[PDB]
Design a protein around this ligand. Structure first.
Ligand SMILES: Cc1ncc(COP(=O)(O)O)c(CN[C@@H](Cc2c[nH]c[nH+]2)C(=O)O)c1O
Ligand SMILES: Cc1ncc(COP(=O)(O)O)c(CN[C@@H](Cc2c[nH]c[nH+]2)C(=O)O)c1O
Lengths: 467, 466
């Protein structure tokens, strides 16, 4: 296409997008498709000659959207949110067009510099300690963008195990890094995200999930008791992943207790705040951040609740030297971010993050978190009022968990009945013996009418199953 | 604050600004004149409480962003390998970003998984890869997944090799620890291989040994056979070879037809890093370097280099998806088990838009033109007797230097860097300091090549009289 044609088709894609996002409630949230559905819809080989633009654009409705799960639907209530927004779209449009890479400062200074300043903005917005800021005069730390929390949590564990292997290597400089790795043990709550076990599997570091209390929170006592048992077995505690906003029921590990134990015992403390981190924009949700000063690293996803489209992960370290010795065989104004991550190439993700922060400003991002939380509090009060249902865990943010009283099958059957029309998207989880519906408030545009309408579909399905 | 009608106006503004930026990119200084830390004093120290205006945000792009940008889309960018955007790539990702679905499982958004499965089959065929790399071929146990980098794909290939080999070592030592067993393992690559190969060694705690190469910087079967015998003799267990098609430094090619049979005989995982040259395999005439590909356990290359898909977009194919998934599962296609992270985005839309918008024949004509512009550059260096060309140009990379010591070449670069009208990075084969000249932009012309050669000539004319 000529530049003149791109200006038309760009306008055409903007108008399509504005309509799509504005009218998304009218879509079936989950597609009715079977695995393998799309192959008979596409040619077996790429086209030799150009397909016309009208044909490609036509295929968006004709063959992409019928298989999409509309994550931007207010009726999406599975997993955790992943929100886009207008500013976010416009930010990536520029980055995609410059298409620079920032493996080093030199390879595109703006890509590193904007990211450094904005991660400092964001650490401040969250109430993170000063020792995570690139520009605090005493800091050894800073923030870098990653693609996922999964990888951020893997990088934290690779930094923890390399650091502690290098310490142990000075008493045993004949011992193999990999042989010393065999003694290490890492811990997390038994509520931790699968990415914590996946980091263990990738790194061949032994990973132990610890029991939790009545609020599904990991406590000081359980970490301390595990550390004592494993040390007396000759294992070397190296790492804890403390989760602020667990996937299942959005519980919070007890940082004021886990922090001191990790510092005393020499364990790298890594905070998975994937979802809940966005809440820390608001002062009144910072209670769960108590003990943050003991963390060696912290990660959360703006790409969940903060209205930046995926990919966008915040990761902070207290000690960037420990991070870089993980990733470079030889171990605060500017840096080469290739030494803070797994790959070489990295793109200009800071543009969309910057635009979102600037376009909303901090107050409206706070208002968004408070609104989302009130919509979940509203949803909760509708469940709580209906004596067929029960709430087996506390709602702290935008996630309500509930179930029909009696056997699991009643809850299974309400889920199946709702899956027939797919007017909302729900996914079952389990907490102990209990099957539960997770209800995640998602879209920044969710209203109390959306909430009531989804509650009434759930109630109509419960009425069906109970009669 | 921003409303739907504001989005529609500012989306136009951004479409117009992108079009003007890419059409006029030759007029900018490819390399910015800034020092580390320049941006901090130009930005508030804190995020704004109230919304900044769209005039201020947009204003800031030329005012404080562009002065710190390396213009990777300039025909005058000649460092690294290319990383090319294209109109159709832009339009595809606009869609993906608005839908903003995640594809960790089939179920989390079917279209994210299926369009990727089908498009990776297209791409495998366009590259002339074996049918054992296709999702939908009857005798295939393998397939293609998109990744973010060659770096991560190479790491995944090493993680799957070492996991496979450790599960096998545990048949005979069922008490030994997975990590203890990993201590015995050894992995190979060219001494020309990319830093991501050593970096995968660092991350996995797997011993890496870099082998010597021939006159043409090519890793030969004889080197690999030697290392293997010496290492087993040491009680080490060979496990992985990464062969490079298109080395970073001089765009050399490892000898696949010798390396393959050895990995197949010795049970070593053979991973192909064709990050840059992979694109040239769209053209049947460049596939001589591919010969021996039937032996590979995996292959990666970057459409995000030369094929006009904006970054990120890496193709990764495995012969054996079960080996790949055992790496990442504690035990419908769920791509979460083919990758490190959980979440993944709908990158297949931009890839499909590019392949459909250009068609194979125009992608093919882009690779040929790019190669013809490097040929033209090579013929300008070749007629000037102050310069030597110490490796063969196979594709869009030409390496050269001033004849005489390294001080001469180094000073020519230091001179060219003063105006930044083209971007060059020093590299080195052996002791010999060279200039890398990469053809980048798909809009590159004979005029652009001559203009760039003339500025390298002027800097050489100057350095040589001093
Ligand atoms: C607590 C927590 N930790 C990590 C992750 C994984 O995040 P990445 O995909 O690695 O960035 C999660 C993920 N939560 C959902 C999936 C999802 C992703 N975006 C919204 N929701 C899940 O069901 O696992 C969580 O919760
Ligand atoms: C041969 C080779 N293999 C891997 C990589 C790294 O690519 P990823 O960033 O991991 O996808 C490269 C990179 N080449 C250039 C940098 C670059 C990236 N895109 C264009 N150029 C380099 O100088 O290393 C190579 O070449």
């Amino acid at each position: 296409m000529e530049p003149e044609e791109y200006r038309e088709r760009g306008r055409e894609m903007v108008d399509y997008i504005c309509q799509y996002l504005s009218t998304v409630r009218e879509r079936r949230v989950t597609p009715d498709v079977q695995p393998g559905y799309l192959r008979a819809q596409l040619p077996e080989s790429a086209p030799e000659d150009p397909d016309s633009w009208d044909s490609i654009f036509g295929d968006i409705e004709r063959i992409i959207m019928p298989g999409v799960v509309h994550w931007q639907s207010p009726h999406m209530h599975a997993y955790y949110p992943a929100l886009t927004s207008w500013p976010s779209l416009l930010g990536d449009m520029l980055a995609d067009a410059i298409n620079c890479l920032g493996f080093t400062w030199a390879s595109s200074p703006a890509c590193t510099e904007l990211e450094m300043n904005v991660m400092d903005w964001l650490a401040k917005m969250l109430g993170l300690p000063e020792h995570f800021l690139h520009h605090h005069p005493s800091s050894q730390g800073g923030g870098v963008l990653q693609s996922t929390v999964s990888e951020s949590t893997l990088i934290a564990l690779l930094a923890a195990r390399k650091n502690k292997i290098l310490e142990m290597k000075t008493s045993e400089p004949d011992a193999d890094e990999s042989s010393l790795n065999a003694r290490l043990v890492a811990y997390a709550s038994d509520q931790a995200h699968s990415s914590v076990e996946k980091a263990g599997l990738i790194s061949l570091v032994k990973m132990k999930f610890l029991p939790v209390d009545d609020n599904f929170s990991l406590r000081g006592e359980a970490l301390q008791k595990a550390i004592e048992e494993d040390k007396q077995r000759g294992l070397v505690p190296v790492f804890v992943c403390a989760t602020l906003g667990t996937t299942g029921v959005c519980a919070f590990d007890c940082l004021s207790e886990l922090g001191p134990i990790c510092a005393r015992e020499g364990l790298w403390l890594h905070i998975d705040a994937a979802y809940a981190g966005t809440a820390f924009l608001c002062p009144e949700f910072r209670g769960f951040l108590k003990g943050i000063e003991y963390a060696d690293s912290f990660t959360f996803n703006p790409s969940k609740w903060m209205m930046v489209h995926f990919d966008c992960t915040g990761f902070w370290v207290k000690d960037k030297y420990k991070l870089q010795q993980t990733f470079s065989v030889n171990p605060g104004v500017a840096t080469d971010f290739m030494h803070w991550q797994i790959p070489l190439s990295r793109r200009f993700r800071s543009v969309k993050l910057w635009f979102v922060i600037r376009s909303f400003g901090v107050k409206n991002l706070q208002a968004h978190v408070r609104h989302g939380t009130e919509m979940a509090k509203y949803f909760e009060s509708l469940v709580r009022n209906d004596p067929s249902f029960e709430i087996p865990a506390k709602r702290h943010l935008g996630l309500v968990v509930f179930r029909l009283k009696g056997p699991n099958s009643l809850t299974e059957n309400v889920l199946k009945e709702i899956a027939k029309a797919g007017r909302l998207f729900l996914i079952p989880a389990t907490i102990q013996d209990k099957l539960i519906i997770r209800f995640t408030v998602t879209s920044q545009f969710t209203t109390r009418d959306d909430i009531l309408r989804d509650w009434n579909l759930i109630r109509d399905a419960a009425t069906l199953i109970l009669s």
